Write an enzyme that holds these catalytic residues in place. Structure first.
Site, PDB file in Angstrom:
ATOM      1  CD  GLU A  85      60.035  34.372  55.134  1.00 54.54           C
ATOM      2  OE1 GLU A  85      59.660  35.008  54.868  1.00 54.54           O
ATOM      3  OE2 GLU A  85      61.699  35.223  54.174  1.00 54.54           O
ATOM      4  NE  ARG A 103      62.876  32.974  79.345  1.00 54.26           N
ATOM      5  CZ  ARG A 103      61.621  32.731  78.329  1.00 54.26           C
ATOM      6  NH1 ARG A 103      61.869  31.717  77.777  1.00 54.26           N
ATOM      7  NH2 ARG A 103      61.403  34.217  77.351  1.00 54.26           N
ATOM      8  CG  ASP A 147      63.996  36.959  86.103  1.00 55.14           C
ATOM      9  OD1 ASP A 147      63.366  37.977  86.566  1.00 55.14           O
ATOM     10  OD2 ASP A 147      63.503  35.881  86.731  1.00 55.14           O
ATOM     11  CG  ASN A 173      66.525  47.493  87.504  1.00 55.33           C
ATOM     12  OD1 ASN A 173      66.547  47.455  88.650  1.00 55.33           O
ATOM     13  ND2 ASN A 173      66.597  46.587  86.456  1.00 55.33           N
ATOM     14  N   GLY A 211      80.829  42.348  89.962  1.00 58.46           N
ATOM     15  CA  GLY A 211      81.715  42.743  88.940  1.00 58.46           C
ATOM     16  C   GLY A 211      82.877  41.829  88.698  1.00 58.46           C
ATOM     17  N   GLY A 224      73.797  50.907  91.411  1.00 63.17           N
ATOM     18  CA  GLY A 224      72.813  50.296  91.830  1.00 63.17           C
ATOM     19  C   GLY A 224      71.458  51.050  91.525  1.00 63.17           C
ATOM     20  N   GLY A 283      66.736  52.343  94.955  1.00 61.44           N
ATOM     21  CA  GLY A 283      66.230  50.724  95.579  1.00 61.44           C
ATOM     22  C   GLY A 283      67.201  50.918  96.429  1.00 61.44           C
TER      23      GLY A 283
HETATM   24 CA   LIG Z   1      70.380  51.792  95.085  1.00 60.21          CA
HETATM   25 CA   LIG Z   2      84.381  42.211  85.494  1.00 56.62          CA
HETATM   26 CA   LIG Z   3      62.227  34.906  85.272  1.00 60.96          CA
HETATM   27 CA   LIG Z   4      86.337  43.960  90.277  1.00 61.97          CA
HETATM   28 CA   LIG Z   5      68.816  48.620  92.089  1.00 62.47          CA
HETATM   29 CA   LIG Z   6      62.562  39.811  87.459  1.00 64.43          CA
HETATM   30 ZN   LIG Z   7      60.294  39.275  54.897  1.00 62.60          ZN
END
Ligand SMILES: [Ca+2]
Ligand SMILES: [Ca+2]
Ligand SMILES: [Ca+2]
Ligand SMILES: [Ca+2]
Ligand SMILES: [Ca+2]
Ligand SMILES: [Ca+2]
Ligand SMILES: [Zn+2]
Ligand SMILES: [Ca+2]
Length: 455
Positions: free
Chosen positions: A165, A241, A278, A331, A339, A348, A351
Site C-alpha cells: 500500500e 549500507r 559485502d 561475478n 562452500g 569464481g 576477477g
Molecule cells: Ca576468477
Molecule cells: Ca556446502
Molecule cells: Ca555494503
Molecule cells: Ca564443501
Molecule cells: Ca569473481
Molecule cells: Ca559491494
Molecule cells: Zn495494490
C-alpha cells in the site's frame, strides 16, 4: 554444467517468452510499474528525490473510499509500518518524517471495519491512494477485521500489505491492469511473465506463478523490480549500507528481512547495497543451495526457490554456503567464496577470487582463460588432494587439454602443476591455444595431483 544452467536461472527480456507470456527485463517491468507517471513531485517527473511526511490518523471526518468504522493504528501496526517505510527509503532517495496533531501528511495510515452501508466487512484487505493534491491523496487503509492487519508483526501478509500500500502511496501501480473487487483477475491476465511476488511486491500473484517457492512465507520488502521502479521515480539512495555488509546469518543490517537468526528462519529479499565489501552468509542452512552474486540474478536459499536476488546496480562480493551440497557463482569482482561442508561447486568467474571448498568433495570450476589470468589470478586456499577437483573441461571447445610434467611444448592447450616446496604452494599453469605466452594461472595453498584436474 550446473553452473551453466544456474547462470541462466530465470532469464528475462531479450525477446524471450515465459509461461506463454512476453518476458520483460527489469527496466521494462519498472516502466510498467510506474506507467501511471505520478509521484509526489508531480506527473512525468523522474529521478527526483523527495522529503515526505507520514501520519497515523487518530480520527477521521470520513474515509475517501466510503468505508466506515474507522479504527486507529495499534502499537504493532505502527512499528511494522515504520519498518515498511524504511524498506522503501533504504533504496530510493526518500526521507520520511512523522507528523502528529492537526498537521497534514503526504502518507497516512488508518484502519476501517465496515462498508458505506454500515455493515461489517471481514472480506477485504487494504487499499491506498496515489500521490496528488486531491483529498485523500497518499492515504492508505487497512481492514482491522483481518488478523494479519492487526498483527502484521506475527502474520507476514500484514507487513507485506503495508509495504504494498505504501508503494501505491508513493506512485507505484500493479504490474498490470487489475484490482480487487473488479471481477476475478489472475496471473493469466498478467501483461508480462515476471508479474509475481518473486519480482514485485506490487503484484497480486504468488511467487509460484514464476517458478519460485517461498513455502507459504511473504517477503515484507521491495523486490528487484520494485527497487528499479521506485528508483526510477525518486532516484537511488547511495548512502545505504555503504560499509562491509553481511546479509543472512550473522547480519549487521539491523533489517529483519535481511536477517536469519537460526536455520528455521526463511529469507526472502532483493538486496540494495550502495558500497563496501559485502557478504551473503547462508552458512546456517543444511539445504542444497544455489547462490549467485551477479547483479540482477536470483538464488535458491535455505530450501526455498528464487527467494534471494540482487538489485540492478549492486555488487555483492562474498558468499558462504551451508552444510548442504551448494553451487556458488561469483561475478566479475574479486570474490571470496566459501562452500562450507557438503560437496560444493565454486565458480569464481572473472576477477582474482579466493576459494574455500570447505569439508567435502568440492569442485572449483573455470569457464575460460579470463577467469584466472596471471595479472589477477585465483587462489584456492584449502584444496584437498585426492578429494577436491578443479574442472577445466570448459577448455575442450578449443582442443582437449593435455597434461605436461615440467615443460610446455608450445602446441598450446596444455596444463602443468608446479610444486613450490619452499612455500608449499602448487601453481596450476595453463597455456591456452592462441596465446603466445602462458596467461592462465591458479595458485593453490596445498598439494594437488594430476588426477584432481578434470580436463
Ligand atoms: Ca576468477
Ligand atoms: Ca556446502
Ligand atoms: Ca555494503
Ligand atoms: Ca564443501
Ligand atoms: Ca569473481
Ligand atoms: Ca559491494
Ligand atoms: Zn495494490
Ligand atoms: Ca573440500
Amino acid at each position: 554444467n550446473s553452473v551453466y544452467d544456474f547462470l541462466r536461472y530465470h532469464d528475462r527480456g531479450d525477446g524471450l517468452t515465459v509461461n506463454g507470456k512476453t518476458s520483460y527485463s527489469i527496466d521494462q517491468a519498472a516502466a510498467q510499474i510506474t506507467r501511471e507517471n505520478v509521484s509526489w513531485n508531480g506527473t512525468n517527473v523522474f529521478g527526483k528525490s523527495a522529503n515526505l511526511t507520514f501520519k497515523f490518523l487518530q480520527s477521521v471526518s470520513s474515509i475517501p473510499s466510503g468505508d466506515t468504522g474507522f479504527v486507529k493504528f495499534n502499537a504493532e501496526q505502527i512499528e511494522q509500518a515504520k519498518l515498511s517505510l524504511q524498506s522503501w527509503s533504504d533504496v530510493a532517495n526518500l526521507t520520511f518524517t512523522e507528523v502528529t496533531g492537526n498537521k497534514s501528511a503526504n502518507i497516512t495510515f488508518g484502519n476501517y471495519t465496515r462498508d458505506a452501508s454500515g455493515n461489517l466487512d471481514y472480506g477485504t484487505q487494504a487499499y491506498a491512494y496515489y500521490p496528488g493534491n486531491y483529498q485523500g491523496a497518499g492515504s492508505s487503509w487497512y481492514n482491522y477485521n483481518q488478523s494479519n492487519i492487526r498483527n502484521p508483526g506475527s502474520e507476514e501478509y500484514g507487513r507485506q500489505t503495508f509495504t504494498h500500500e505504501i508503494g501505491h502511496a508513493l506512485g507505484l501501480a500493479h504490474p498490470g491492469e487489475y484490482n480487487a473487487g473488479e471481477g476475478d483477475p489472475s496471473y493469466n491476465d498478467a501483461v508480462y511473465a515476471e508479474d509475481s511476488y518473486q519480482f514485485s511486491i506490487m503484484s497480486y500473484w504468488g511467487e509460484n506463478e514464476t517458478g519460485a517457492d517461498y513455502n507459504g512465507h511473504y517477503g515484507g520488502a521491495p523486490m528487484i523490480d520494485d527497487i528499479a521502479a521506485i528508483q526510477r521515480l525518486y532516484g537511488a539512495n547511495m548512502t545505504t549500507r555503504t560499509g562491509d555488509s553481511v546479509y543472512g546469518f550473522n547480519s549487521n543490517t539491523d533489517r529483519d528481512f535481511y536477517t536469519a537468526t537460526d536455520s528455521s528462519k526463511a529469507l526472502i529479499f532483493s538486496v540494495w547495497d550502495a558500497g563496501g565489501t559485502d557478504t551473503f552468509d547462508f552458512s546456517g542452512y543444511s539445504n542444497n543451495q544455489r547462490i549467485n552474486l551477479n547483479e540482477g540474478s536470483f538464488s535458491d536459499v535455505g530450501g526455498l526457490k528464487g527467494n534471494v536476488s540482487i538489485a540492478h546496480g549492486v555488487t555483492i562480493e562474498n558468499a558462504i554456503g551451508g552444510s548442504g551440497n551448494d553451487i556458488l557463482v561469483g561475478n566479475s569482482a574479486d570474490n571470496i567464496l566459501q562452500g562450507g561442508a557438503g560437496n560444493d561447486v565454486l565458480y569464481g568467474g572473472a576477477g582474482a577470487d579466493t576459494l574455500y571448498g570447505g569439508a567435502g568433495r568440492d569442485t572449483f570450476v573455470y569457464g575460460s582463460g579470463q577467469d584466472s589470468t596471471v595479472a589477477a589470478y585465483d587462489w584456492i586456499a584449502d584444496f584437498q588432494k585426492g578429494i577436491d577437483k578443479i574442472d577445466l573441461s570448459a577448455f575442450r571447445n578449443e582442443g582437449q587439454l593435455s597434461f605436461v610434467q615440467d615443460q610446455f611444448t608450445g602446441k598450446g592447450q596444455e596444463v602443468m602443476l608446479q610444486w613450490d616446496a619452499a612455500n608449499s604452494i602448487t601453481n596450476l599453469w595453463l597455456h591456452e591455444a592462441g596465446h603466445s605466452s602462458v596467461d592462465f594461472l591458479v595458485r593453490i595453498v596445498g598439494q594437488a595431483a594430476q588426477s584432481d584436474i578434470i580436463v
